[PDB]
Swiss-Prot record:
Mutagenesis or variant effect for residue 62 to V: In EVR1; loss of function
Tissue note: Almost ubiquitous. Largely expressed in adult heart, skeletal muscle, ovary, and fetal kidney. Moderate amounts in adult liver, kidney, pancreas, spleen, and fetal lung, and small amounts in placenta, adult lung, prostate, testis, colon, fetal brain and liver.
Domain free text: Lys-Thr-X-X-X-Trp motif interacts with the PDZ domain of Dvl (Disheveled) family members and is involved in the activation of the Wnt/beta-catenin signaling pathway.
Stated name of the protein: Frizzled-4
Subcellular location: Cell membrane
Subunit structure: Interacts with MAGI3 and NDP. Component of a complex, at least composed of TSPAN12, FZD4 and norrin (NDP). Interacts (via FZ domain) with TSKU; TSKU competes with WNT2B for binding to FZD4, inhibiting Wnt signaling and repressing peripheral eye development. Interacts with glypican GPC3.
Disulfide feature: 2-63, 10-56, 47-85, 74-115, 78-102
Record family assignment: Belongs to the G-protein coupled receptor Fz/Smo family.
All ranges on the Extracellular side of the membrane: 1-121
Function: Receptor for Wnt proteins. Most frizzled receptors are coupled to the beta-catenin (CTNNB1) canonical signaling pathway, which leads to the activation of disheveled proteins, inhibition of GSK-3 kinase, nuclear accumulation of beta-catenin (CTNNB1) and activation of Wnt target genes. Plays a critical role in retinal vascularization by acting as a receptor for Wnt proteins and norrin (NDP).
Disease: Vitreoretinopathy, exudative 1: A disorder of the retinal vasculature characterized by an abrupt cessation of growth of peripheral capillaries, leading to an avascular peripheral retina. This may lead to compensatory retinal neovascularization, which is thought to be induced by hypoxia from the initial avascular insult. New vessels are prone to leakage and rupture causing exudates and bleeding, followed by scarring, retinal detachment and blindness. Clinical features can be highly variable, even within the same family.
Ranges where the FZ domain occurs: 1-118
Post-translational events: Ubiquitinated by ZNRF3, leading to its degradation by the proteasome.
Length: 121
């Protein structure tokens, strides 16, 4: 039921299996890996120690046999990462993309919603 993560920048997270489609709409890991390259300057810059985990959690979200939904990031981590990384996008004339809008993620790991919050699987 769950597929291993083929994306190289996503291979050290604490989980290693996923299920497409991801939280951005890709059916294929390979398309997600291509789109991920857009962010490598940001990752290289080091605006947030959580950026890689956050992007991987969105582009290649955690799958488990016990759960029928992709498990993505919590809104809290998204807001934290946005706070640190959006300034870098903006100084270069870009913006925090709509597809990473922090509203589309659950606010906290509830018993009413599941999401990840740190580099914790
Ligand atoms: C981010 O996502 C949120 C949640 O969908 C958006 O909030 C809605 O935005 C639309 C478009 O203007 C409004 O019609 C709704 O009334 C908004 N809902 C709420 C609760 O604010 C938001 O527009 C998106 N963009 C940003 C930058 O936050
Ligand atoms: C995936 O990662 C976990 C983390 O400890 C490891 O125990 C498991 O053997 C790994 N499996 C694969 C297929 O990478």
């Amino acid at each position: 039921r769950c597929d291993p993560i083929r994306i190289s920048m996503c291979q050290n997270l604490g989980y290693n299996v996923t299920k497409m489609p991801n939280l951005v709409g890709h059916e294929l890991q390979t398309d997600a890996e291509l789109q991920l390259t857009t962010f490598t300057p940001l990752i290289q810059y080091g605006c947030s120690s959580q950026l890689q985990f956050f992007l991987c959690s969105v582009y290649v979200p955690m799958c488990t046999e016990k759960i029928n939904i992709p498990i993505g990031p919590c809104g809290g981590m998204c807001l934290s990462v946005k706070r640190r990384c959006e300034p870098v996008l903006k100084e270069f004339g870009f913006a925090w993309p709509e597809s990473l809008n922090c509203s589309k993620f659950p606010p906290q790991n509830d018993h009413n919603h599941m999401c990840m919050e740190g580099p914790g699987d």
